[model samples]
Target chain A: SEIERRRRNKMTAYITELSDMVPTCSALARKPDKLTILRMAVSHMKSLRGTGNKPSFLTDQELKHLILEAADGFLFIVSCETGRVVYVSDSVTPVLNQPQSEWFGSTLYDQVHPDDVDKLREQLSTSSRRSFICRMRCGNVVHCTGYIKCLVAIGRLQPTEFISRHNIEGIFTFVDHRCVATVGYQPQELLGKNIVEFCHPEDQQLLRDSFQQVVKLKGQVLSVMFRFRSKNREWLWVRTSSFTFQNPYSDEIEYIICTNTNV
Target chain B: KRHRDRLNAELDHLASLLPFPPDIISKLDKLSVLRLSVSYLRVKSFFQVVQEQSEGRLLLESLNGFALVVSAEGTIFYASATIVDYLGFHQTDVMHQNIYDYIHVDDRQDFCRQLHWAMDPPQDDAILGRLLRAQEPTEYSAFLTRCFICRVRCLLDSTSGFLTMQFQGKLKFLFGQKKKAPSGAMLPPRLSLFCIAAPVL
Candidate 1:
């Protein structure tokens, strides 16, 4: 009977841990039923695998069509000049632990893990396409250790012949979340700021040189690995590749595309 | 015994349907079989997702550069023939070799960190490093050559039922010496005779 009791206690503990890790019963005033906890756990695992619900932006029809394309990844577009999230795929919710409504109009700095903010800013300031890895917040809170493999690239919005200068535009692709805790942020706090202003002085110059190289090469892919400051004031090492090209829509505007992977 | 045999027969039938190679499947024990079956299904499902996204399996293949599938322990399970052309080693020579063996000693620490990161949460990125030539001793920088390193992506395969890393990148070479100076050298500004005379005066 003692062994049976101990086994039951261990089972209870594991169930408690599962319930704690998931969001479903976290707000409940009382313990949820076993079936409910198990169901939520299953759903959480599915979402982590990028097989969860379709992002809200996708119409059911669009999702069905997308299921045929690549349903396993999430994508987002950000404006260069404003550093705002112009478009985020619905998949953001399951992958980043945040809703689409919370991401729009918010600058990427708002969601970037505190340690990577400075390096990301410097990297984007240059006219190059680079890939690097950095941590990002998942849910609505700042989880200091929460990080994910985010592939980011900066590019330019097409400019008209009369307007040779164009604002910067870029894209982000998220592969998976690395931390158990999800992190999130307030967009209003970070929008409209130059990302480069936050970079560590030394890194700022490195990014400038990298950008100049990309420009000199006329859009050739250049790769580099460097440390980036996150929102938490932590520095995370990232391997990034950047490229530059003229915006197809306008002859004058050039875009820098970058991709990152956390090492 | 009859019931166990029946169950084993069913397991064998199920294993046959899996995407793994016959030798690998046959060698798996019951627990391993169960685990691999689950991973295989998940990988298959993920592939379906990839197919739906307009990206084909061909996208996983490296076009111009060499490709490798390495285990979590850094053992090379698969190496492309192009690796021979790049590293001067035969594909068979590279197989089963710890990837670290090819990496320069100066870069082994960074490579270890990259491998550790790649195995967890499974992300992809590029790194720069030097690779050793075939039959080269692990000494001196001259034996190693610089190259661009990129982890193409990670996938769960039979090599590691949980996670495996893929790499793709081209080797970079230093330019060889040219025999003659080019016409664009400007000929030392045509040896400006007038300037020489002025300086003498």
Candidate 2:
């Protein structure tokens, strides 16, 4: 946008100069070759105007999904509105253990494990869009890392997660739009649940604001430490840093697109 | 009129790629004045502008885009490391040619007018002409594609028989708000906002 504005001003300046240069076009009309010169200039200008604005980039959605999948984490390209899944990569099974069939028709809230649903929904209800990370039980497993993004769309109150099995050690890469945590554990089952249920109730508000800010500052790195209780009833400290991507195509902020590096 | 028309055409192409606000140019112009007044910019800002605007063309022209001092006849009396490519010409070619030959044909007319108006003359026109022609092969598309509209104000140092040509080229792109002008407009005067100065004796 900044680049476009500068170009317009320069064109205007050039146009003004050209106008001054040929104050009397009629005088040069008799020269047959003059029209050729004029035509060349005109053609050059026309080409200049026509050439630059072609939308020439392709987003690697498949590659993005592969990156999410290779991390052995759950990944979904979601519609910020209606909380509908745009393209959910095959890795969905790794995190939730449920095939794509079940996950596809469900609301993000429905997929979150039942016990954590109420608190997570409550937290999602009162905030601006952001990403929230929390621990949730997968079958009998006590804790797993999960990522969530609050919906910025109207009439849709949902949060999406790209979850990974909870692990204690490994090299985690935090990229612009994806998160990779090489933790040693199975995919955490709570893919569609509210994060507030797992977060210490006292830390919920702080976490909410933290997620809010990350969404606001698109494409920024944010690291936050929050406490949550495990399935074994033991308290654990988890640190997650989220990177947000804004859809250059839309005004709405995209996702709290995050990564968890246990610090 | 022809040059202006061509520049406008080029400007239109640039506008579609870079549509920033007019104030940014004004801000840049002010910044240039500030940098010049302070004397802190010994080619730093100029190089930065070159890098930002047309990096490929700048590199293609001079390899390093450095400052240089040229004699009035266009001999390379002193060349900056940044200008190695520009300085690589054979000495015979540069001994007496007027300096304007190396400039793009589209740009040379205006540059010459300004050079004359500034009251400077070639001390070694023949050699300078050869050197200028030697550099012509390299100037085609690259010169036209460079980012700014440029102008040079020559400072003649009679005692040293040198001329300081301060070149400036301005960003020629337009903003998104303006409607695209018709492609068949006339050429405008060559006034470049991005200034790249090299002093020549």
Candidate 2 lDDT, B22-110, residue by residue in tens: 34323333222222111111112222333454411211122112333233233222222233233444322332234555554465554
Q: Write the per-residue lDDT of candidate 1 for residues A1-263, one digit (tens) a residue.
A: 36577555644554554455455555577779655664565555445445323212122342322221211234454444566565555555665566778777665666666556766565545453344545665436211111122223211010000001112422221111211111111223224443344346777777667766866766455666566555566665655555555544354455554444345
What DockQ does predicted model 2 obtain?
Answer: 0.01
> Which stretches of candidate 2 lie above 4 Å from their native place?
A1-98, A107-111, A136-263, B1-8, B17-201
Worst 10 residues of 1 chain B by lDDT: B191-200
Candidate 2 residue-wise lDDT at B108: 55
Per-prediction TM-score, please?
A: 0.23, 0.22
Q: What is the DockQ of candidate 1?
A: 0.02
Instruction: Mark the regions of model 1 whose C-alpha exceeds 4 Å error after superposition.
Output: A1-263, B1-7, B20-36, B52-109, B115-201
Q: Interface RMSD of every candidate?
A: 22.4, 23.5
Model 1 global lDDT (CA atoms, 0 to 1): 0.39
- Output candidate 2 Cα RMSD: 26.9
Q: What fnat does each of the candidate structures reach?
A: 0.00, 0.00
